[PDB]
């Protein structure tokens, strides 16, 4: 499913993402925007290391979810990567929460550093009533 901006903003707030481990809602919005375009079925195979990014937050199979074909991988979220491709984003959110519980926090996603860090991200949540 492709979420509309404010729809996603309100959904994430309801799932408790606002301020989770110090990360504001607008930052999560910026991340979802640049990672998937707010699309839950987005997948990206990385030919370089044989891992695949899944879902709205493009979570990587090498550490977070199990897809069986990624070599020397772990499954920290204890989820099949299939779970990160559902229209209902509850599992993707629970896994995103697990990712930021690691020392790097939101920095675990390089796209966040490139397109969100130190920028005015208010625009991603303006007018959404979230």
Residue 36: HSE in the Cβ half-sphere, 13 Å Cα cutoff: 27
Cβ burial, residue 14 (10 Å; 0-12/13-18/19+): exposed
Strands laid side by side in the 43-46 sheet: 43-46, 51-54, 59-60
So which residues are the catalytic ones? 35, 53
What are 61's two structure tokens?
């199979």
What are 51's two structure tokens?
């891992």
Longest dimension (CA), the chain: 44
Q: In the chain, how many domains are there?
A: 1
CA distance 65 to 83: 9
Looking at the DSSP bridge assignments, the partners of residue 46 are: 51
Cβ burial, residue 39 (10 Å; 0-12/13-18/19+): middle
Resolution rounded to one decimal, in angstroms: 1.8
3-state secondary structure of 76: coil
3-state secondary structure of 47: coil
Q: Residue 102: phi, psi to the nearest 5? A: -85, 155
Note down the domain range covering 56. Answer: 1-130
What are 120's two structure tokens?
């005015």
Chain length of the chain: 130
| E runs forming strands in the chain | 43-46, 51-54, 59-60
Whichever domain contains 38, its CATH number is: 1.10.530.10
CA distance 8 to 4: 6
Whose structure tokens read 């930021």? 100
């Amino acid at each position: 499913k492709v979420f509309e901006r404010c729809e996603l903003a309100r959904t994430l707030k309801r799932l408790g993402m606002d301020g989770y481990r110090g990360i504001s809602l607008a930052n999560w919005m910026c991340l979802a925007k640049w990672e998937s375009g707010y699309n839950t079925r987005a997948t990206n195979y990385n030919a370089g290391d044989r891992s695949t990014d899944y879902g709205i937050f493009q979570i990587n199979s090498r550490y977070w979810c199990n897809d069986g074909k990624t070599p020397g991988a772990v499954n920290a979220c204890h989820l099949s990567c299939s779970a990160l491709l559902q229209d209902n984003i509850a599992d993707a959110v629970a896994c995103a929460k697990r990712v930021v519980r690691d020392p790097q926090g939101i920095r675990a996603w390089v796209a966040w550093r490139n397109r969100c860090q130190n920028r005015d991200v208010r625009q991603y949540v303006q007018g959404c009533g979230a």
